[PDB]
Design an enzyme around this catalytic site. Structure first.
Site, PDB file in Angstrom:
ATOM      1  N   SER A 159       0.853  -1.158   0.000  1.00 40.73           N
ATOM      2  CA  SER A 159       0.000   0.000   0.000  1.00 40.73           C
ATOM      3  C   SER A 159       0.905   1.228   0.000  1.00 40.73           C
ATOM      4  CB  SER A 159      -1.049   0.026   1.171  1.00 40.73           C
ATOM      5  OG  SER A 159      -0.506   0.527   2.400  1.00 40.73           O
TER       6      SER A 159
ATOM      7  N   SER B 264      -3.925   0.436  -2.340  1.00 45.39           N
ATOM      8  CA  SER B 264      -3.714  -0.834  -1.622  1.00 45.39           C
ATOM      9  C   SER B 264      -3.890  -1.938  -2.587  1.00 45.39           C
ATOM     10  CB  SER B 264      -4.738  -1.000  -0.467  1.00 45.39           C
ATOM     11  OG  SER B 264      -4.506  -0.052   0.581  1.00 45.39           O
TER      12      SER B 264
ATOM     13  N   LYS C 185      -6.413  -3.973  -7.040  1.00 48.33           N
ATOM     14  CA  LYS C 185      -5.874  -2.677  -6.681  1.00 48.33           C
ATOM     15  C   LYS C 185      -6.997  -1.681  -6.401  1.00 48.33           C
ATOM     16  CE  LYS C 185      -2.871   1.080  -8.388  1.00 48.33           C
ATOM     17  NZ  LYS C 185      -1.872   1.509  -9.428  1.00 48.33           N
TER      18      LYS C 185
ATOM     19  N   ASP D  49       6.586   7.411 -14.509  1.00 50.55           N
ATOM     20  CA  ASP D  49       7.165   6.928 -13.233  1.00 50.55           C
ATOM     21  C   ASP D  49       8.008   5.689 -13.429  1.00 50.55           C
ATOM     22  OD1 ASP D  49       7.480   7.124 -10.443  1.00 50.55           O
ATOM     23  OD2 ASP D  49       5.625   6.123  -9.932  1.00 50.55           O
TER      24      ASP D  49
HETATM   25  O1  LIG Z   1      -0.531  -1.747 -12.439  1.00 47.79           O
HETATM   26  C1  LIG Z   1      -0.240  -1.890 -11.281  1.00 47.79           C
HETATM   27  N1  LIG Z   1      -0.368  -0.835 -10.365  1.00 47.79           N
HETATM   28  C2  LIG Z   1       0.109  -1.360  -8.954  1.00 47.79           C
HETATM   29  O2  LIG Z   1       0.123  -0.660  -7.979  1.00 47.79           O
HETATM   30  C3  LIG Z   1       0.472  -2.774  -9.058  1.00 47.79           C
HETATM   31  C4  LIG Z   1       0.918  -3.413  -7.957  1.00 47.79           C
HETATM   32  C5  LIG Z   1       1.560  -4.764  -7.837  1.00 47.79           C
HETATM   33  C6  LIG Z   1       2.563  -4.976  -6.722  1.00 47.79           C
HETATM   34  C7  LIG Z   1       3.173  -6.168  -6.493  1.00 47.79           C
HETATM   35  C8  LIG Z   1       2.809  -7.236  -7.336  1.00 47.79           C
HETATM   36  C9  LIG Z   1       1.850  -7.022  -8.390  1.00 47.79           C
HETATM   37  C10 LIG Z   1       1.477  -8.174  -9.231  1.00 47.79           C
HETATM   38  F1  LIG Z   1       0.851  -7.780 -10.364  1.00 47.79           F
HETATM   39  F2  LIG Z   1       2.522  -8.990  -9.448  1.00 47.79           F
HETATM   40  F3  LIG Z   1       0.658  -8.797  -8.385  1.00 47.79           F
HETATM   41  C11 LIG Z   1       1.204  -5.792  -8.643  1.00 47.79           C
HETATM   42  S1  LIG Z   1       0.278  -3.252 -10.513  1.00 47.79           S
END
Ligand SMILES: O=C1NC(=O)/C(=C/c2cccc(C(F)(F)F)c2)S1
EC number: 2.7.11.1
Length: 274
Positions: free
Chosen positions: A14, A19, A35, A135
């Site tokens: 998060s 989150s 998400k 980003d």
């Molecule tokens: O487009 C996106 N925007 C976010 O904040 C994401 C977070 C994310 C974080 C760890 C793992 C994964 C996973 F896709 F491997 F699960 C997704 S993906």
């Protein structure tokens, strides 16, 4: 409609992005990420081909969905009275590039070449779909550890690509160019190229070059690990102080340091343990 479609697993993280939970689509046990974004924290909205009012993130993600695996695919999305929920594909096993760098420290050049090339391919795809990520950094890159394929993620700071000046920014400061720092103005490609220089420095040195505004503005690059002259040259070129002095994606990819990249699968074999 509604989530009874998904079985919610553990929180993955998060932050300023919201989150994000590990999940599974009940209808085929496909791994997903779920998400949640609060309506309060969405400064930026658009509307789709369909033409309803959604967060810019959703607009951008729809513009980049395809079978091309270098960018995260949005599988679905839902509105709630105070938030939007997004369902994204989730590779498994997976590790973000920030954690991988925490574990292994500075990367071997062959490996950094392979990852950085795949990042270039992803970003070119986005620019192609008319999307500017804004980003690019190791925390927004996922490594599919079985296949050795990287995935760009998190478009919550992105914008439609355009050829005029941007005077707004909500991505990561230490990856933002000198012109954003000093003038609050940049153009899309060249700001993207500077953050690619930060990223490549990060991969080969194990950390980013600049922490403070002053260092960014100065643009002087000190190498703290052994890095080939071809690699330092590419980095120093991506991090030219004047925007117009930065390479285009095609110059980055025609750079001598970028020749003879391994295939994703070769990469996982030699470097990730496949
Ligand atoms: O487009 C996106 N925007 C976010 O904040 C994401 C977070 C994310 C974080 C760890 C793992 C994964 C996973 F896709 F491997 F699960 C997704 S993906």
């Amino acid at each position: 409609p509604l989530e009874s479609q998904y079985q919610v697993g553990p929180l993955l993280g998060s932050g300023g992005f919201g989150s994000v939970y590990s999940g599974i689509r009940v209808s085929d046990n496909l791994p997903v990420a779920i998400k949640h974004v609060e309506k309060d924290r969405i400064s930026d909205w658009g509307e789709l081909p369909n033409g309803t009012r959604v967060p810019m993130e959703v607009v951008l993600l729809k513009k980049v969905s395809s079978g091309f695996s270098g960018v995260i695919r949005l599988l679905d999305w839902f509105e709630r009275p105070d938030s939007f929920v997004l369902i994204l594909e989730r590779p498994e096993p997976v590790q973000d590039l920030f954690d991988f760098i925490t574990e292994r420290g500075a990367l071997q050049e062959e490996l950094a070449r392979s990852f950085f090339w795949q990042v270039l391919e992803a970003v070119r795809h986005c620019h192609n779909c008319g999307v500017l990520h804004r980003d690019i950094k190791d925390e927004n890159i996922l490594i599919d550890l079985n296949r050795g394929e990287l995935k760009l993620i998190d478009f919550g700071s992105g914008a439609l690509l355009k050829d005029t000046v941007y005077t707004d920014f909500d991505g990561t400061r230490v990856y933002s160019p000198p012109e954003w720092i000093r003038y609050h103005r940049y153009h899309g490609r060249s700001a993207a190229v500077w953050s690619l220089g930060i990223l490549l420095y990060d991969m080969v040195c194990g950390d980013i070059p600049f922490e403070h505004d002053e260092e960014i503005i100065r643009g002087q690059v000190f190498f703290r690990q052994r890095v080939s002259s071809e690699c330092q040259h590419l980095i120093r070129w991506c991090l030219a102080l004047r925007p117009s002095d930065r390479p285009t994606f095609e110059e980055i990819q025609n750079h001598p340091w970028m020749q003879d990249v391994l295939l994703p699968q070769e990469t996982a074999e030699i470097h990730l343990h496949s």
